[PDB]
Amino acid sequence: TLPPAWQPFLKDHRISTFKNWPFLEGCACTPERMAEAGFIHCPTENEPDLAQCFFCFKELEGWEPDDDPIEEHKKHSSGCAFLSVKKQFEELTLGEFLKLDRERAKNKIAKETNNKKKEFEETAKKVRRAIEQLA
Template sequence: MALASPSLSELFEEDSKYLFRDARLKSYTKNWPHKEPNLSPEKVPFVIQMADAGFFFNPGNSDDDDDNVQCPFCFKQLTGWEPDDDPLLEHQKRQDRCYFVRMGKKEEDWTVQDFMLLLAQRRCASLVSSIALFPFWLIFQHSLPTSLVHCCSIFATIFMLHSFLYSRCLFCFSIIIYLFC
């Protein structure tokens, strides 16, 4: 079975509408479960913090994850929010390679390059999650002795050459090779 590379249209699927802050903010009007004063949708500062930290409300199917949020760039999902949680700090602690968090800019300050790198990370996160679903792939990385995710989490174009795929990291320019087992 071959793994098809996601198309450009797949890059802009359902959760891509949350790339921008206003849409992330609006997602919290849909059944945000917390009734505590610090976590209710009426407590605008916390909801704004969630959206500013890159999260949109994406409830799960069980009561345990009914306050699940997700980043549309790195796809990190977090649940179990408590009144004293800081959304940006939680995002940084749980996914420190997220370019959105590392960039530290408000949306109105983004450049075209920033947006393209955010889309590249989104593509990379999609690729990494696809690879995780297919255990018959071996991942080899040149130049860096650490994991695939450490390689800046952002790849340039994925190329097909004979029986393997390779890409180049946009930051450290190391080559990452994916071989079929």
């Protein structure tokens, strides 16, 4: 069908990600509205409401029933190129798409690099504290 590492790109798959999810009809941040904004529901015990943009990888929790998924997304990751995509997926050119997929994988990389940095830095304090205690 569609390459199973490219479905986050189409709304239906994004909706289909919403398994539990509170907030439905009556609320502004429905599945449909989350998915139109780029969100994927990636739930856990510690937080069963966490949403992630498939494109920029921003993770946002603490959803309020009247949060606008789009505004919520602009006012937390102004960078996201997905916000700029104003064409349907089928209406995308292979270039446009391949361009978008380039920036995506990059984001995936920058996100993983920002993470490695922090873990490193945290390790560096514990080592430094320890050798300090020895002082």
